[PDB]
Amino acid sequence: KNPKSDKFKVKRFHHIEFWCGDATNVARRFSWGLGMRFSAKSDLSTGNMVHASYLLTSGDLRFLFTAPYSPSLSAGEIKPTTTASIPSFDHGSCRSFFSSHGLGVRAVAIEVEDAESAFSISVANGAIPSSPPIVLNEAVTIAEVKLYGDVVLRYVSYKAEFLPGFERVEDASSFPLDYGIRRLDHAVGNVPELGPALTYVAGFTGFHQFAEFSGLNSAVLASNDEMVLLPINEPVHGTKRKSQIQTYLEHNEGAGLQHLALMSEDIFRTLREMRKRSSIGGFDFMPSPPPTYYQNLKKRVGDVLSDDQIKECEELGILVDRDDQGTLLQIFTKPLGDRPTIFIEIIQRVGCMMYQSGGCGGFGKGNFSELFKSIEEYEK
Amino acid sequence: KNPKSDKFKVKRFHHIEFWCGDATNVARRFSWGLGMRFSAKSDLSTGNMVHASYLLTSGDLRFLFTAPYSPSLSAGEIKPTTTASIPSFDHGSCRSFFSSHGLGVRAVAIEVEDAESAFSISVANGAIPSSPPIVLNEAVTIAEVKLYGDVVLRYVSYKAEFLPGFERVEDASSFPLDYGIRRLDHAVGNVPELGPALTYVAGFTGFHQFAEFSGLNSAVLASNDEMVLLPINEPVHGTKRKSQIQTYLEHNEGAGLQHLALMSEDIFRTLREMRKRSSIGGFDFMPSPPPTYYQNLKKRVGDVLSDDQIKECEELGILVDRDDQGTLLQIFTKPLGDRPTIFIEIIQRVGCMMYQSGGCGGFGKGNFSELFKSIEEYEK
Ligand SMILES: Cc1cc(-n2c(=O)c3cc(Cl)c(C(=O)C4=C(O)CCCC4=O)cc3n(C)c2=O)n(C)n1
Ligand SMILES: Cc1cc(-n2c(=O)c3cc(Cl)c(C(=O)C4=C(O)CCCC4=O)cc3n(C)c2=O)n(C)n1
Ligand SMILES: [Co+2]
Ligand SMILES: [Co+2]
Question: Which residue intervals define the domain VOC in the entry (chains A, B)?
Fold first, then answer.
C-alpha cells in the first residue's frame, strides 16, 4: 500500500556530500574506482577561503567531497561576508565529524519544490533543525535538518550548474570516465534503535513504509513515487555471529550512513570495469559466494537471465534476488575507508515497467538465507 | 669541502611517514599516481586497534600512510599493553597535526647504526626529544627528535620486513606497479627563519653545509657521504611576486616539509607514465615552461643530451640544470592535497661516477634565472 503522505513535494535524490580531511585525494580515488567525472569545484582557485569542495558525476549521480581549510584563511569573515559556497559549512563541525567518524557521508540531499517550505513543515513536524534556509544568488535555496547521528537531510530547490559559487572544471582536467553508473537508488542508515529513528523521520517527512518480501532488523521509508528510498537498520544482539550493524556503531562512534546503492545501466560492465581497478587504486569487493550459490540460481531466476548471463554473474560475484514484481542484481564493496563502516552497493533492477517503478525487486533480503544455505552446501 | 662531522653513523633515508585522516584513500591515490606497490600493512586486520598504517614501495623508496582509529577501540590499553605498531603514535598528536596542517609529512626517517645512541647524542647536542628510543621485538629500535614545525627526524636501527607488527600484503592485493621511481633524493623544509633552523639541525646531527652553484634563501645539510640531503628554505619578503615559501607558511599554519624529491632511473618513462594518469586519479604537474626555454637548452646541455632527448624533455615539460660536475633533470608536481603546501619533485642525475656521489648537479637553482629570462623571450 502507498498512502502518498509526503508533507511536501519531493523530487529526486540530488547529491551526497562526504566530509573528508583532504577532499583532493578522496575525490581522485573515488573518480578512478567508480568511473565518475570531475565536473565542478569550489576552492581557493574559485575564491572559497573556507572549504575545498569537488563534485564527481556519473549519469545523474552527484558525489560531493568537502574538507576544511585552515580557519586562519577566513578569520576576518563573518557569516554575511563568507566566501564559503555551502553556507551551512562550519570548520568545527567538520573537524569534529571527521575526527569522530572518519570518512563518511555528512549530507543526503534531495531536491524539493520549495526548500524553505520543506524546512518549515519539517521542523513543525518534529525535525531537529541543522541549518536554516539560505537563498544562494537568488537562484537556489538550501536547508538542513538532522536525519540520524551526525548525518543531515539537505533540501535543495531551484527557482529555474550544481550550486552558485561552483565552477565547471577545465576540459583538460575533466577526463570522461564512465563505467555505467547512473543514479542513486537508496541510502541506508544504521542506528542503535529502529523504532524511534523511523518514528522521527517518517514523522517530519510523511514518508511511508515500503514493504519487502540476519544480524539486523530494518525498514524502508519512501517518498510518494518511491524514488527517494531511505532504509534504516538496527542490530539484533545475542546471535552466534556478531551483528555487522553493532560493529558499525562501535567503529563509527554511533549512528550514521551505512551504505549507498548506485544503479548501473549494465551491472556486468560496471563490475568488470571496477574489478579491473581494485588493486590499482579502486575498490575491493566482498568475497565471492561459494560455487553452490550459482549452482542454484538457475532454479530461481532461470526465467529472467540466460545460462550465459548467470555464468557471467558467476565470474563477477554478483548476487541475484527476486520479489513478486521484479528481480535484483546486487554486489557490495569492502568498506570505502580505514574503518569497517561505510560501503557501496552496485545494483541493477529488472521489471516493473509502466519507466521503472522504485524498489523493483526489493533490497535483496532473500540473499541472506540463500547465502547461508549455499555456504552449507559447498561445505558438504 | 666535506668535513665529515656526523655525530653518529647515518646510513640512508629509510621511509617518509604521512599523517592522514583516512590512510586508505591517500595510499591508493599515491600508489596509482606514482607507481608504487602495496607491500606491508598494520591495521585492524593485523591486531592494531590504534592506527591504520599502509606502506607503499618503489625501488628503495618507502612511503608510509597512517591515520588514527577511534580512541574508544583502545581505551583499555596502556602504553605497556599497546597494540600500536608504531609506539610513538598518539591519537591527539595525530588529529592535532592533520587538523592544523592537513595532509603532510610527519616523519623523515633515516637508518642509523644505533638509534638509542643517535637519540642520546642528538639530545645531548640540543635536539628537542619527541619520542624516546623503544626496542621493537628485540629487533628494531626507533626514536624521534623534532626537526622543524611538527615534523620529526626518526632514527631507525636494525640489529640484523619493514617494522615488527607489519604484515606483508596479500599477492592478490599487491599489484606490481612501477614507473621507474627508485629512491628518495632529498627532503626539504620551509621555515620562517633559516638561521636558527640550520643552527639547530646542524647542531645535533653534525651535518655539514652542501654548497650549490627567487622568492627564497636556502641551504642544504648533508651527511658524511652526502646521501642524506636535508635542504631548508625561508622566504624573502618585499618582492614583486609573493614568496611561495611565505604562501606555504600561511596555508600550512607554520613550518613543515615542503617537497620530496624522488630519483627515477628513467625520468622520461616516469613522466610519461605519471602524466598518462594525471586526470584519472594521479598527479598534476607544474605548467610547462615557454617554448623559448627548450630553444636555449641546446646551448647549455647539448653536450650531455641529444637533440632527440631535448625534444623529449620538450614534450614532458622537464627542466634541466647543470653544475660543475653533473647535470640535473627535474620537474615538479602541483600540490599533493587540498592546500598549496607539499608537492613532489621527480629527478634524475647525470655524472659524478666513482656509484654516483650525492647531489650530482645540485638542486636546480639555475633554473630560476633561466625560466625568468625564457618567459621574457617567449613574450617577445
Ligand atoms: C557473504 C554475505 C553477504 C550477506 N549479505 C549482507 O550482508 C547484506 C547487508 C545489507 Cl545492509 C543489504 C541491503 O542492501 C539492505 C538494504 O539496502 C535495505 C534494508 C536492509 C538491508 O539488508 C543486503 C545484504 N545482502 C543481500 C547479503 O547477501 N550475508 C548475510 N553474507
Ligand atoms: C615556473 C617556475 C618554476 C620555478 N622553480 C621553482 O619554483 C623551484 C622551487 C624549489 Cl623548492 C626547488 C628546489 O628543489 C630546491 C631544493 O630542493 C633545495 C634548495 C632550495 C630549492 O630551490 C627548485 C625550483 N626550480 C628549479 C624552478 O625552476 N620558478 C622560479 N618558476
Ligand atoms: Co541496499
Ligand atoms: Co628539490
Answer: 12-158, 183-334
